[PDB]
Design a protein that fits this description.
By secondary structure, the protein is mainly alpha-helical. The chain has helices at about 1-10, 15-25, 30-40, 50-55, 60-70, 70-75, 110; strands at about 130-135, 135-140. The radius of gyration is 21 Å and the shape is extended. The chain binds one DNA strand of 39 nucleotides through loops. It is found in: Nucleus.
Amino acid sequence: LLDSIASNNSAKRKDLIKKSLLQLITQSSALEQKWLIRMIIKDLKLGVSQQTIFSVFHNDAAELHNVTTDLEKVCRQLHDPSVGLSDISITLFSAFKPMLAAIADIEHIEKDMKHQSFYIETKLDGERMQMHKDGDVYKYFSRNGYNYTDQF
DNA sequence: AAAACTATGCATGCTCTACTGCTTCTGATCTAGTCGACC
């Protein structure tokens, strides 16, 4: 039902969205409808961190989610708790969580660089993107893993 | 010369086809607000 509603919103159709929501309402209880509303809004407020959920799911799941950024692969590969992954590293056509930068104090900057020469670069204002190229197959991914390939 | 039959013009009713006014449906435009994702 959620897939139908999302695709149908993407297709510029509202009568079908109304039908799907009506079916969900008619075939749900008050608590189920409340939870469904929370998932639609994309907030649950469970009080438990996503990192905790991933850790309980498998020993090495946060790293795999960072490298891949797709709940399907993490859920599929990490099924048997005993069986782990030998080596996890960036792979083609799979979004990876970008590496960010933290505030720095000009006074102790040299100390933060272990008293060694460093690189100074200009700050760029705009979107953060990553490009995957294999032959003439191109994929573009945004900061959080959304696919912007259609635009570019 | 008188009576009977028939012709034609007009009255009456009915039915059918333009034209004007009122009400309601549809389309096009504008204005206001909502949702996505990022920073």
